Each structure stands twice: as structure tokens, then as C-alpha cells.
Write a protein that binds this ligand. Structure first.
Ligand SMILES: [Mg+2]
Length: 209
């Protein structure tokens, strides 16, 4: 016990330089550097699974961003872990997994019952983001689990609108095949077809037609 505590305090001191710049805790680092072993030790030592760093990330956000599947599962099995924790900009772990295209975690968070329709501060859901970066796999998983397909962000943009706007051909087709409404316009009455045409995304324009 003395050995465990003394080590934690010693390691903590050597890592404070880093943590003072990021606002992270030892658990954040375990997640960021993918150390499943260290992650368990810290949680058993009483580490707060929901502590936030300078951008509002909890160790769960960190695990997703670093694709630390081990630490991720260790956090998911921890009942105190808030799966819907929000970064300062409103980003949840599921939104991060979709936007960063981290494999496996989109399905895991959904299965673990994370709020599938949560949106960041710009009104964008995990589905909005998956569409924007053409993470077609996440788009299909989200849709299979009934994510709101026609959800609109603060600019009234639907995921289909973003896929058209950002040139995500595969994601656009996936949304259309799942009956996303292509007639829902943004705050400027622009159709997904309009923004695609304006940006010369002819392939997506044909798709919408
Ligand atoms: Mg899995």
C-alpha cells in the first residue's frame, strides 16, 4: 500500500509539467498514451473518471481520441463513468468517435446506451459529423441504431446537407438509401443539392437527382 501510494505520488510529480499545460489528470494520460494497465491502477486508487482537462475532455474523450480501446473498455465498465460527458464545445465521446473515425467505439458507446442524438454546441450530432467527414461506417451504424436521420443543427443543416457540402459521396448515398429527406433546407433555404452544385460536387448532385 505504501509502495502503491508512493509510486502514484512520485509518478504524479514527474508528470505535473505536462498536466499543468493540458489540465489533464494521471488518468487522462493513461488514456492518451493507451495504458490499460495504468488505467486500472488509477481507477482502483480512486481516480475520477469524469475529471475534465482544459478543453473539458474527460479520460473517456481522451481514450477515444487516442484510440485506446483498452482504456476505453475499462472506462465503459466503470459505472461512475459519464458516457455523455461534454467538452466545453459540447462534444460527447460518441461525437468524437464519429468525427475522428475511431473504429469500434461508435457501436460500443451506442450499445452502452450513450445518448445517440446528443449534439455539440453548433447543434451537430454524431451523425452530422460522421456525414461531414465521410465516416460512412459510422453513418450506417448510427442509422441502424435509429439515430435521428433528419436532425438539424443550429444552421438547420441536416447530416445529408453536410455530406453534400463537404463532398462525402459515400455518406450521402448511405443517408439517401436510408430515406433522409433531401428537401430539408438550411437556414438560407439552400437544398443539399444547392450547396453541392455550388461547390461543384457533381457526383453528389446526380445522386440527389
Ligand atoms: Mg465492440
Amino acid at each position: 500500500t505504501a509502495q502503491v501510494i508512493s509510486d502514484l505520488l512520485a509518478q504524479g510529480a514527474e508528470l505535473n509539467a505536462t498536466m499543468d499545460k493540458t489540465g489533464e489528470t494521471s488518468l487522462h494520460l493513461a488514456a492518451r498514451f493507451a495504458r490499460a494497465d495504468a488505467a486500472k491502477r488509477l481507477l482502483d486508487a480512486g481516480a475520477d473518471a469524469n475529471s475534465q482537462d482544459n478543453t473539458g475532455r474527460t479520460p473517456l474523450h481522451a481514450a477515444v481520441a487516442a484510440d485506446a480501446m483498452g482504456v476505453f473498455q475499462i472506462l465503459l465498465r466503470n459505472r461512475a463513468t459519464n458516457l455523455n460527458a461534454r467538452m466545453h464545445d459540447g462534444t460527447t465521446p460518441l461525437i468524437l468517435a464519429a468525427r475522428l473515425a475511431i473504429e469500434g467505439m461508435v457501436e460500443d458507446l451506442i450499445t452502452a446506451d450513450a445518448d445517440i442524438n446528443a449534439a455539440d454546441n453548433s447543434g451537430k450530432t454524431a451523425l452530422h459529423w460522421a456525414a461531414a467527414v465521410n465516416n460512412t461506417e459510422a453513418v450506417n451504424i448510427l442509422l441502424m441504431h435509429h439515430a435521428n436521420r433528419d436532425a438539424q443543427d443550429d444552421k438547420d443543416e441536416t447530416p445529408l446537407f453536410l455530406a453534400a457540402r463537404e463532398g462525402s459521396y459515400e455518406a450521402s448515398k448511405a443517408l439517401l438509401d436510408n430515406f433522409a429527406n433531401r428537401e430539408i433546407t438550411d437556414h438560407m433555404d439552400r437544398l443539399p443539392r444547392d450547396v453541392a452544385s455550388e461547390r461543384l460536387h457533381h457526383d453528389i448532385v446526380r445522386l440527389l437527382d
